[PDB]
Amino acid sequence: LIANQFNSAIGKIQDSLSSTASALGKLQDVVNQNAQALNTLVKQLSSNFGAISSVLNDILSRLDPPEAEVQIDRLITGRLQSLQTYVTQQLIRAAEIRASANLAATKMSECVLGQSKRVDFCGKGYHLMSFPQSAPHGVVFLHVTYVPAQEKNFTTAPAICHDGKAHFPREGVFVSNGTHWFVTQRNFYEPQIITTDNTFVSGNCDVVIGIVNNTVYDPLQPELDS
Amino acid sequence: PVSMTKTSVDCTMYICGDSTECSNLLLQYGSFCTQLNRALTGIAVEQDKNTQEVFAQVKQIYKTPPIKDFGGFNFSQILPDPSKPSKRSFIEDLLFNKVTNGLTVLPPLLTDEMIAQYTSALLAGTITSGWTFGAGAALQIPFAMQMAYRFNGIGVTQNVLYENQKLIANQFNSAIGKIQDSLSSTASALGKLQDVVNQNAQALNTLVKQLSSNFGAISSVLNDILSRLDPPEAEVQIDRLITGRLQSLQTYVTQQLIRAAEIRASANLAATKMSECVLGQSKRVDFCGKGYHLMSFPQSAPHGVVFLHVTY
Amino acid sequence: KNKCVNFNFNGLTGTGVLTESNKKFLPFQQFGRDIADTTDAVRDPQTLEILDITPCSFGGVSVITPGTNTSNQVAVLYQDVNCTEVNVFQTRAGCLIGAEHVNNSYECDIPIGAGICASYQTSQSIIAYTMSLGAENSVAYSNNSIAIPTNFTISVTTEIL
Ligand SMILES: *[C@@H]1O[C@H](CO)[C@@H](O[C@@H]2O[C@H](CO)[C@@H](O)[C@H](O)[C@H]2NC(C)=O)[C@H](O)[C@H]1NC(C)=O
Ligand SMILES: *[C@@H]1O[C@H](CO)[C@@H](O[C@@H]2O[C@H](CO)[C@@H](O)[C@H](O)[C@H]2NC(C)=O)[C@H](O)[C@H]1NC(C)=O
Ligand SMILES: *[C@@H]1O[C@H](CO)[C@@H](O[C@@H]2O[C@H](CO)[C@@H](O)[C@H](O)[C@H]2NC(C)=O)[C@H](O)[C@H]1NC(C)=O
Ligand SMILES: *[C@@H]1O[C@H](CO)[C@@H](O[C@@H]2O[C@H](CO)[C@@H](O)[C@H](O)[C@H]2NC(C)=O)[C@H](O)[C@H]1NC(C)=O
Ligand SMILES: *[C@@H]1O[C@H](CO)[C@@H](O[C@@H]2O[C@H](CO)[C@@H](O)[C@H](O)[C@H]2NC(C)=O)[C@H](O)[C@H]1NC(C)=O
Ligand SMILES: *[C@@H]1O[C@H](CO)[C@@H](O)[C@H](O)[C@H]1NC(C)=O
Ligand SMILES: *[C@@H]1O[C@H](CO)[C@@H](O)[C@H](O)[C@H]1NC(C)=O
Ligand SMILES: *[C@@H]1O[C@H](CO)[C@@H](O)[C@H](O)[C@H]1NC(C)=O
Ligand SMILES: *[C@@H]1O[C@H](CO)[C@@H](O)[C@H](O)[C@H]1NC(C)=O
Ligand SMILES: *[C@@H]1O[C@H](CO)[C@@H](O)[C@H](O)[C@H]1NC(C)=O
């Protein structure tokens, strides 16, 4: 069942990526931002900034050096401020991209190379494993996570009383289908008979709030009887 | 801090406020102002993304049942209070009360009532369902037994909780009361949020005050230059003012971009804390308060989030 | 008064709406300034009345549109204005024209601001509504009820960085 579910999930990833393009908006945003910045940088070459012509060669071929100096100074001021703007925006954007790259390196180290217990760091669910996939100027992680599916109401109890001794579950939780009490692992319903091998005894019955009564089946007594 | 104030500024009205000659002179500079507006709009969109990342982490809007048998733990000061008009908690109300030319301030996409609804959903999920509602469908669990699970997550067996439940509940209620009293007494707590607010206010005020500077021109008033000088020389003076005011905008936008990068780092940290600290239980040391982390409760705040880290 | 005029008092000039203000100038004071050195009140030289100056209303004009591949019908958002200064909807985010107000709440598609979103839903036209935070739920919490999942789903999610 688990292998089939995983194969189906990979198939659904294929279907989504071959269907909708909106998934890679994060990479496309980077590409578009950089392209728009370069387009603005180029279009700033065609501005006058107050000079008689945006083209340097026209000013040079039209004016004597004393006035060509003033016009070229105007153009130089404008274009140098354009590069200053472009470089500042690029530095800020590259800091943001480096933050994303550090996050992706952390996700690869803690998410592909191991199993993360951090919540929502590796996809929504209980992280199982992650598979990296390269992408143009980026990385795509396929986070395989465990998601509980079909939950059933149960009656629960913090502990149970057997002989004046309060039994708490070792690794699990006491539940009751309505008549019989069981101990089950808390993430997946598999009922088990409450024995001394499933529980541990601490203190007496007068303290725990919500304690209930049941028999803790001692395995050794039937063996002694037989 | 999670978000800034979504401020947008129009060049043509800022540099050349209602002036034909100045606007014509400003045309020569190209797309400087288109890219200024683009940078500011990108910042504002990022601010909405910050708030959505931090708070909109819960699929369904859970709500605590009218019966409040939380094993003796008293969450009345953090759960929503319907008596107030806006469905905010007592501590959220304290937090909100403690914080005090082409320039537009765009309203945030999520209103404060919606932010409070998200924090309410997160509290209800954490209280009534532990960490399960982050992994999947919210599964109810008695709060005493959830605290037993959290104790087991720090290396203390659950019998300790069950045998010291009354003392633990009293200690937790005492701690919540101490939070209330501190947040009613001293305003020095919310310096992190008030600093963001003050920095933005100083930036905008300086940007406006820059309209009173000559930048070398005969006057900082543009109509006065127009009514005093002949067009050939008024062009030079207006170009001086345009260069000065355009530089003022460029400085303001660059500074806002850097500050917004800082705020986005803070908002990513807040999103990580909400995911790993409210929706779960963290074994990362000192990431969720000084101690062994048991559970955390979020509270909305003016342009920020407040985490109440319960630690052992 | 109460009209966008290009005034010119004693020496100071500007554009705005002049309204009967209740500020109390001193007898020698002529005009008032804001915290940011911006003139907001002027004493009328002929009759000693104090007039508050408010800038003539302005703001961005934002066009809300689904994809042209989907439709060529749009809506317009006049930011932070009275709807009279412009199927008309007044919001906190401005004046919205061309979108039909709906009392239903849906998942946000095109963000407008202050909790209002827009979308192109059905016979199809632009709708504007208070965005929905999610499907409101109440957990069946009680002091002895636990829910334990009896089955699981292995999900593969894509994260792009
Ligand atoms: C709770 O579980 C117990 C144990 O499985 C159920 O008791 C068994 O029920 C089946 C059929 O219902 C019988 O064939 C067994 O003989 C029963 N065993 C014992 C020891 O009684 C019990 O019926 C379940 N209760 C509910 C309400 O479903
Ligand atoms: C679990 O079993 C114990 C023992 O039978 C119950 O304790 C009895 O409680 C009643 C009333 O509180 C007393 O009159 C008896 O004297 C107690 N027993 C003894 C041996 O002293 C206890 O009440 C049971 N709990 C539940 C929930 O049924
Ligand atoms: C949870 O704590 C709050 C605050 O201490 C309690 O509310 C107070 O209750 C007392 C007694 O009824 C009143 O005199 C106060 O006026 C209340 N204060 C406020 C701010 O409402 C509340 O009773 C506690 N809940 C439980 C179940 O003990
Ligand atoms: C300027 O002259 C006008 C009229 O020539 C004055 O207006 C009069 O002002 C007085 C006192 O304020 C009022 O009693 C009259 O009703 C006004 N007359 C009219 C026709 O409105 C005005 O006061 C003068 N102002 C100055 C500063 O000399
Ligand atoms: C757990 O859920 C899975 C998935 O719904 C169930 O497997 C399905 O079983 C039906 C009936 O045999 C098949 O038609 C489907 O093809 C199965 N799904 C898959 C993905 O193989 C499974 O039966 C459930 N387990 C329990 C105990 O309820
Ligand atoms: C558990 O019981 C409550 C109340 O009877 C109900 O609201 C809830 O749907 C039940 N859970 C399931 C999984 O049916
Ligand atoms: C749960 O609350 C009900 C309602 O009063 C009460 O009868 C019952 O004893 C409580 N049980 C526990 C374990 O708190
Ligand atoms: C419009 O969108 C559809 C997908 O719904 C796509 O198949 C189609 O090519 C698009 N039209 C154009 C002109 O791109
Ligand atoms: C905007 O103008 C209209 C018409 O005068 C008015 O009804 C409305 O109240 C104004 N806006 C606000 C926020 O009051
Ligand atoms: C939406 O609610 C308002 C407020 O009561 C009401 O006047 C209006 O008729 C409602 N619209 C519809 C379509 O029901």
Residue numbers in the entry:
A (entry chain A): 922 to 1147
B (entry chain C): 728 to 827, 856 to 1067
C (entry chain A): 535 to 620, 641 to 676, 689 to 727
Paper text:
To develop an understanding of the structural basis of nanobody binding affinity, we carried out the biophysical and structural characterization of a series of six nanobodies targeting the receptor binding domain (RBD) of SARS-CoV-2 spike protein, comprising a hit from screening a naïve nanobody library and five affinity-matured mutants derived from this parental binder; two of the mutants have been shown to be potently neutralize the virus. Recognition of the RBD by the nanobodies is dominated by CDR3 and CDR2, with CDR1 only making a few contacts. At the heart of the interaction of these nanobodies with the RBD is a salt bridge π–cation interaction involving R52 from CDR2 of the nanobody and E484 and F490 of the virus RBD. As a result of binding to this epitope, the nanobody directly competes with the binding of angiotensin-converting enzyme 2 (ACE2) and thus is neutralizing.
Single-sparticle cryo-EM confirmed that the parent H11 and variants H11-A10, H11-H6, and H11-B5 bound to the same one-up–two-down conformation of the spike that we observed for H11-H4 and H11-D4 (29). As previously noted, this arrangement results in additional contacts between one nanobody bound to the down-configured RBD and a neighboring up-configured RBD. It was proposed that nanobody binding drives the spike into a single arrangement, removing the all-down conformer and various other ones. The spike protein on its own is dynamic but the binding of the H11 class of nanobodies apparently “freezes out” this motion consistent with the increased entropic penalty for binding.
